[PDB]
Design a protein around this ligand. Sequence first.
Ligand SMILES: NC(=O)C1CCN(CCc2ccccc2)CC1
Lengths: 412, 412
Amino acid sequence: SRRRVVITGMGMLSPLGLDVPSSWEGILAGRSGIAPIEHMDLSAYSTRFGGSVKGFNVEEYLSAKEARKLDLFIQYGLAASFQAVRDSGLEVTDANRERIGVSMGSGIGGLTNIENNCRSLFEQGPRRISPFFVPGSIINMVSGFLSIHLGLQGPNYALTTAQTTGTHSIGMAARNIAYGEADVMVAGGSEMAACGLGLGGFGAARALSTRNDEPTRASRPWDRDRDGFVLSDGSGALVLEELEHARARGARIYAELVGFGMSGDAFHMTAPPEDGAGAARCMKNALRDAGLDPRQVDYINAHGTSTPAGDIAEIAAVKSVFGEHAHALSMSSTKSMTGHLLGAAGAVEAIFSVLALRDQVAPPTINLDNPDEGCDLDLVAHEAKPRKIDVALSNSFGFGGTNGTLVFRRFA
Amino acid sequence: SRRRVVITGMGMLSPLGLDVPSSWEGILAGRSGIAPIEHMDLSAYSTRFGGSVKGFNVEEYLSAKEARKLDLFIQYGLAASFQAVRDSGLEVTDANRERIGVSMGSGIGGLTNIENNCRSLFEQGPRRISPFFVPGSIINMVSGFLSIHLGLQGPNYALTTAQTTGTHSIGMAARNIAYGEADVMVAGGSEMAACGLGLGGFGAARALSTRNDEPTRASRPWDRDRDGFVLSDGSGALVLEELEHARARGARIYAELVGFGMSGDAFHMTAPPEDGAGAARCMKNALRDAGLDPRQVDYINAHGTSTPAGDIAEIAAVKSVFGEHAHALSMSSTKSMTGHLLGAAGAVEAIFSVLALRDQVAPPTINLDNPDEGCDLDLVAHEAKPRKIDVALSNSFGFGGTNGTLVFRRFA
Ligand SMILES: NC(=O)C1CCN(CCc2ccccc2)CC1
């Protein structure tokens, strides 16, 4: 048998806001976080816009000296994690610290730091590389620094599954709790790939929208005029907690995490199969894990990247899984507003899925002006849709054909 | 309820050989894989040697056309994975492809490729960044490319827990199988961090041995004249398989994986605590997971990095976990010969632990001329020791205070 897992704390940096409530207010208002990138010369570049975190103050969390040791993606992960642990009210003690762990991941990790240290290395040789280069750049240092700061002695690890990172991180943390390896996990992801290497790297693969004239219309999932994803920065963290542990301390419980699915497409390094076969197996795995019939799903937070092939595969996968229920559920891409946070996408989208349950509202797919061929589902075009939501899925489908699905349910 | 997990295939690249048997021959002969680095000019660096893979032929696995797109850590992880799958005799079918997954990790991932593309960017502009920059560099693409080449549709993910990565990857892949998420997993790690930023960044932290004039003696775990770790490259992969699934197909079983432990030190970003308290918590977790009396432990493949603080903390943790039995077991560091393969360390050392069980021999700790204060256990100094081994333990410790332990035992 298996223990139940609930969400008792959430934390976020996104292009819409420096916490969950500010971000969620923007999501329900259909506001875009996408703008031309600043203090960084994107002249030789075909994409000059994205989703930046605006006005982040790391000294609310860390001393300036400790912050100087850490890449932005680690700072962002620690901010979301500290927010989530505060939001949970949990008190870490000698009696429970071995039962509290961390799984915060990243898809690309410390590109800004690597870039800045390449500058030193090429211009002056190795003796100018920062002594903190390695520990301040490696993906597991959000989990590492958080564990050291809060005294967490539970399972300590980090996933890196590209654009699926946040989803897998939360799912595998839920497994730790369900199977009794921890009572509490801080789980999610962070990303800051807006450097020459990130915009250049995706740009060289012609993966990005080049809609420089209208950055806020660039992210348009399922719209016939879409032309690739929008690169975005930030972090999401959830406090996952065993149910009896949450009830014993009088925790506020947002939602229950009832299902986790994983699959591999085994198809292509970057492109999904046209029919979304692996995304369909992953959703069916998640529903089987939750003991739920596809008919019980009310809301899907899509991967919805605004790539031609990705968006159409997800429609095919939902029609395949849900059959005569596929039009009854609501499915929206919050990437229409946030852009694509890569490894943090799944983390912030799990939070939006939990808030859809709390507030009984499907967030919009903004910019869905002209649905493409076959995109005839309820994709919540333009404006938020109050409706009944008992069961909410969050999907992530990333490079290497790696898929994740989380199933959340209302808790009462 | 929890299923049993066996090892049916292994694969490797190490500084000692281009497969498992060649690597193991070097281990049992006390041979060093450490030499001055040839693939780049290190005259400006404080460390100029390491454990390189010698004579690797990517072409016996992949087309040279596909290899050109992939960082060496990915090529290395694929090589070990292909070897392990072949060694298992498993045939991928429509009947089983959804039940076979992959978890191959890395501590740093594609630092060579990122460095080379950063050089292109700075010297020539963003239009010279490779279109394959992202999928040829990011850590999850061993799991991704392996799934594409072999048709594996099961759980597809990757860990990144610094020097613990290979141990965590194997342990968590075993849990997938134990809990019914998969019947087979290919799991381990790969690393090729021998680039300017790698040698420069560990050099900046003064973490590396600077014994440039005698590289084969640099790696000297528990020796009083040790002065840091030796950076090494390669990969280890194991095929983990549910017991009844292995028995059902007449698989050759090398050993059973009975125990997995994780803990966080919550102490320091890079330094282990001198008393080895997190390591001790991790080993106790693993021994309890395996249902063992600690006196059953015959052999420990130590982390044994050849750092002053790390090596002594391991002695303290083993004495704390095993009490008087600490004097009866044998403990060695094969990093004495291979150097430190970082995220691959736990993967090649899991293989060495399984081969210790197969051959009933404790591999030597070479270079242990003068054991330091309190380093008075059986550390198998200089020469391989034939002995009874029913139970073998492999430990890993990493940045962020992240600990892993695997417990293997003979299968009858
Ligand atoms: N000692 C050597 O040089 C060995 C190294 C391993 N090779 C490759 C074997 C292989 C190829 C494809 C798939 C699985 C395995 C054979 C030669």
